[PDB]
Amino acid sequence: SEESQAFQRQLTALIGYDVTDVSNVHDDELEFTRRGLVTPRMAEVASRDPKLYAMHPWVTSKPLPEYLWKKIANNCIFIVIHRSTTSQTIKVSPDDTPGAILQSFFTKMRDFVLRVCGRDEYLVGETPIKNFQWVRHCLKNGEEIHVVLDTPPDPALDEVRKEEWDCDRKFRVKIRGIDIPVLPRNTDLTVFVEANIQHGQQVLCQRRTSPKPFTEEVLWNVWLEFSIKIKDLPKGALLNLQIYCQLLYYVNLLLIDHRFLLRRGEYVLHMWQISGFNADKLTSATNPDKENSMSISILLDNYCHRAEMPNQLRKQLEAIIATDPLNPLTAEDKELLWHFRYESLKHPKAYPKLFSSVKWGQQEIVAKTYQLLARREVWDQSALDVGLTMQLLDCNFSDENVRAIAVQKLESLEDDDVLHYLLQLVQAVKFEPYHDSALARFLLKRGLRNKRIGHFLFWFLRSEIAQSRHYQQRFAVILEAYLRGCGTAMLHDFTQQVQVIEMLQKVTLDIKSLSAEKYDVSSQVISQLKQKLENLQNSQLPESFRVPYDPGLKAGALAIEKCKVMASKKKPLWLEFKCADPTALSNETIGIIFKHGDDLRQDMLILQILRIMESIWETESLDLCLLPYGCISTGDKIGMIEIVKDATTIAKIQQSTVGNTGAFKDEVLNHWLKEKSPTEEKFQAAVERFVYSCAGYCVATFVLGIGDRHNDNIMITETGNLFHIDFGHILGNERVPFVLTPDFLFVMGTSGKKTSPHFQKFQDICVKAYLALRHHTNLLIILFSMMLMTGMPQLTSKEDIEYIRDALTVGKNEEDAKKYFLDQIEVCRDKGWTVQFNWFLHLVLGI
Ligand SMILES: Cc1ccc([C@@H](C)Nc2c(C(N)=O)cnc3ccc(C#N)cc23)cc1
């Protein structure tokens, strides 16, 4: 129409990419996908309750962990209900619904709502108050549960806009040639084309051109006939073309298209270059950069389209099925699993390994696989196992029906668990052969159902659209779909957040880049900071905006006075904001560190695995006091990081008593904690929160292979909460497992070889946290494995992915694992500050 064009440009600005752009396409899959997603969008918009979607209660079905009954076991929960200037405390029973708090409130004094003080967080719906996230949050941080008796939000604001032959012959392909605008880097070199028919990372068969000398234009015009017959090409198979001289470029093309058609015609594919196994390598997307990218020209021209297992082998099948996900299946293992596929079908944990034994390059076999899939009885009734469900969505599976069953299983995850695996489900869209998939439809649907899932979905897709040329197209189409159903209100918030971000990026692109060597932040530099901000504050940066890593917090006016440019190299901005909420329980500002220059995706990955580890521990009634702080990549190499209220780095606690020396003293940390604590009640509580948090980061770090850090990369609160930071240093550009130094030891009651009531508690907390994570070996393995394939371009080999197997003492028993971890604690005590002193030499100087 007309206003429908004005809308697209809004979406385009929100998305950060134009989805109707067709300058880097070779078929209509993307446009076909924007079409396929209209249905599930509209099917969910029309399906959600307008009142509960406007209010997004954040609730859980999980048991209330035992470490929180140790604060309300007496069946009484206090809830401060506030009004204008009058408030009232009320005692509640863990099972009282927010609706039932008109009977134990209005009587003491029906169409009102209970909203949390200073937040867009509502306590409503037919749910027990114990099961509210905000409630468990206060209980955990021993906080008063302050709410506000106010009227519900008008759903009318969520208004969604509206809106409306040779079939059995061997497969062949012709390599016409390749061409690059420029190349001179060395002398004359040799070069050839490797064509692989792939399906879920396995080479069905491979062919090569003869090698020619490497010139601007290299022409072959040769047909390459393959060992697979066209009728055998499975759906989702990939023609992967690579250039060696060794591996320099690659591009992929789906053999079968989105409409079940075999691919026919001429093609000129602009390739991706390698910098000398990675999710980028599997993309069907071509390089948009035509001016400077290698291209390959091809021609495609084809037409279309119950004996029971015996004892001993039974034990083999079983020995196979119980192995870790990162264990190769030999040719004998595959034959066993396949021939006894009906036995294999009764063990859900065997699905990944059975599906990796299917000869996808033989259509009769695929057909039996589908016949097999039609049963599925057990799988349908199996207890949802996320680590198992994720294993079917990695790079090792390309079949749509296989991956669809994994999604079918995800359908039963509740909102708060979706929130836990969300980032990783989004990353997993990178392993889908087609743009429209059961996984993508699912994320569309969960985000459209719940405002909080929607909020994060938006940011996660946008960080990929902003810094991934390989998948931005696919992801933009998915974000547009979501944006077209989230609602007018949310569309308005997202607009406010994007405006602020672009405004902050531009302020940083001016102010930043005025310092090329560590410490140098002058009055001149700040003058400009507080100046451009001063221009912005003036009826420009929106009234307010939801905090991207904390959607329930609305940030208001910028306290320009409190802003500065941080000491460090990349010159991040230290921003301070007034909370636009008046009913907020305090005066405190909102501190956000806005950085440009770094891709923060790797950090989000790390912090989310941490939120995952805490979720595991909760199942085992443990609370390790990790502080996984807000961190959202918000655009190309830019982002928002949360500032934790009263924290400093471990290095500066050492620095502010000694100096710029590596002559670290055991005392200063406990000295800092006592000094910063008012009463002795708060000091003991802080020694205790330190004990927990320290154990927390020790295991967490070790398990992830990131425990060996300089103490400037570690921080603590005035309350004893320890926490790691900047996970990009290490995963971007003599050793130890984690960080258990004399100062941490001093706080716990020891120095070199001793033992104490706190240190003994520390050791025990570790072991029970480590062993709880081993109960989830397979799961942490597939997460890590997936994290390295989609999060970091470098660490992308079999070897790197293995690290975690050794770390989780896979195969060994809880007993030996107890020793293995105590060992580690021991390689730490047997080094005091060796390493900290080395990192000081290494990093702080230039050694
Ligand atoms: C870019 C940047 C890196 C490192 C910092 C550290 C030193 N400061 C942080 C401070 C603080 N009081 O300064 C408070 N909270 C934080 C939370 C997270 C990170 C991360 N990652 C750093 C800080 C700040 C900003």
Side-chain angles (χ1 to χ4, degrees), residues 166-169 228-234 262 304 362-364:
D166 53 34
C167 183
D168 201 306
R169 305 231 157 191
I228 167 168
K229 301 174 162 186
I230 291 176
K231 67 171 198 182
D232 288 312
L233 292 180
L262 184 55
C304 266
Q362 286 290 339
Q363 88 96 161
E364 200 206 346

Side-chain angles (χ1 to χ4, degrees), residues 566 572 574 593 595 629 641-644 647 649 715 725-726:
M566 305 202 66
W574 175 284
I593 291 165
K595 188 176 191 185
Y629 53 81
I641 290 168
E642 171 184 27
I643 303 174
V644 185
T649 76
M715 301 189 69
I725 65 98
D726 270 51

Side-chain angles (χ1 to χ4, degrees), residues 324-550:
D324 45 16
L326 281 167
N327 193 40
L329 288 165
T330 187
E332 179 166 328
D333 289 1
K334 295 184 181 172
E335 295 179 7
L336 212 159
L337 277 41
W338 179 253
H339 194 261
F340 299 103
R341 55 192 185 269
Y342 290 82
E343 179 52 39
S344 297
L345 176 63
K346 305 174 194 302
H347 306 232
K349 259 180 161 48
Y351 286 47
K353 284 155 176 291
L354 168 66
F355 297 112
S356 312
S357 304
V358 168
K359 290 170 177 183
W360 299 100
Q362 286 290 339
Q363 88 96 161
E364 200 206 346
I365 296 295
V366 175
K368 289 168 186 174
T369 299
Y370 288 15
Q371 284 289 37
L372 197 293
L373 282 166
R375 262 44 186 166
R376 208 192 303 188
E377 185 76 354
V378 177
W379 185 260
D380 295 358
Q381 294 162 22
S382 67
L384 163 53
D385 170 353
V386 192
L388 215 201
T389 303
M390 294 296 299
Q391 299 181 44
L392 298 175
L393 303 162
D394 68 48
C395 54
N396 297 116
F397 307 94
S398 293
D399 183 77
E400 59 158 348
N401 290 296
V402 162
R403 303 174 65 95
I405 82 185
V407 177
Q408 160 208 134
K409 212 62 185 177
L410 291 169
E411 309 279 346
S412 77
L413 274 170
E414 55 174 30
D415 287 352
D416 78 303
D417 272 339
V418 165
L419 283 158
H420 281 269
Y421 298 95
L422 187 64
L423 181 43
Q424 299 219 265
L425 292 177
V426 171
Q427 294 301 314
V429 178
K430 290 174 172 170
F431 304 120
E432 290 295 331
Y434 301 93
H435 301 301
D436 188 344
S437 68
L439 179 57
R441 281 163 184 244
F442 167 79
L443 294 164
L444 205 212
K445 302 156 180 182
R446 298 305 296 265
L448 280 182
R449 182 183 309 170
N450 180 285
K451 277 192 177 194
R452 191 188 174 88
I453 280 158
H455 173 85
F456 288 105
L457 182 59
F458 172 96
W459 292 105
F460 297 163
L461 292 170
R462 203 189 197 270
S463 72
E464 300 300 322
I465 298 155
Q467 35 216 331
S468 173
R469 292 177 301 157
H470 297 83
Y471 297 94
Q472 66 185 163
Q473 298 175 285
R474 175 172 296 177
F475 282 127
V477 163
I478 306 171
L479 187 47
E480 171 195 45
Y482 166 76
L483 289 165
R484 288 183 182 274
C486 61
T488 286
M490 294 196 93
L491 274 176
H492 173 90
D493 301 342
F494 291 129
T495 307
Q496 302 299 57
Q497 303 172 59
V498 172
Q499 283 174 335
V500 164
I501 290 297
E502 294 176 352
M503 288 181 181
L504 287 173
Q505 183 182 210
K506 197 279 193 167
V507 159
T508 305
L509 289 191
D510 283 340
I511 289 69
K512 193 203 71 165
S513 79
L514 255 289
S515 59
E517 207 62 50
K518 59 202 306 181
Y519 61 96
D520 57 307
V521 187
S522 67
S523 300
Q524 172 178 295
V525 168
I526 288 174
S527 175
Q528 264 295 111
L529 185 271
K530 290 177 175 174
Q531 181 169 336
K532 266 304 201 299
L533 291 177
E534 209 158 356
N535 298 158
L536 299 198
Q537 184 71 312
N538 287 339
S539 188
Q540 196 62 33
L541 71 81
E543 188 82 56
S544 52
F545 63 95
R546 331 220 88 158
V547 171
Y549 57 86
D550 194 3

